[PDB]
């Protein structure tokens, strides 16, 4: 399709680079959200049941 | 003119033949990761 379009694959390369940058940004955002969720879960555990907090901190 | 365009396309494909395969593999891996993440999010939302 890109060959019949009449252009080179350089535009496809730039689009792939932009998609990779967007995927890296989305992965960073998802990792930040997962870290925030883990922090909130640890806080809820420490405020509710210290047994699970001690297990995750020393036993794991 | 058509032959010149075809030769330019062939040259652009031959100068970046392995790079094209690497970019395709990277794009496929990124798409698979995004699909897996979306599926996990949908499953978590449906379960919760």
């Amino acid at each position: 399709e890109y060959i019949d379009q009449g252009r080179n694959p350089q535009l496809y390369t730039k689009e792939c680079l932009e998609r990779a940058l967007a995927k890296n940004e989305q992965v960073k955002g998802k990792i930040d959200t997962m870290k925030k969720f883990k922090s909130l879960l640890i806080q809820e555990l420490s405020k509710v049941f210290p047994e699970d907090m001690a297990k995750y901190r020393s036993i794991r | 003119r058509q032959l010149f365009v075809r030769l330019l396309a062939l040259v652009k494909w031959a100068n970046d033949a392995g790079k094209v395969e690497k970019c395709a593999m990277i794009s496929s891996f990124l798409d698979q990761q995004a699909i897996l993440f979306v599926d996990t999010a949908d499953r978590l939302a449906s379960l919760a």
């Binding site: 959200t33 969720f37 | 999010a41 978590l44 939302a45 919760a48």
Partner: peptide, 29 residues
Amino acid sequence: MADRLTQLQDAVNSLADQFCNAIGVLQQA
């Protein structure tokens, strides 16, 4: 009343609301 069922239902509703809020914030001042 003052029975265990009231507090149980309250805790269940709170847990359900927390789960719904977490699901909403995970796929989104």
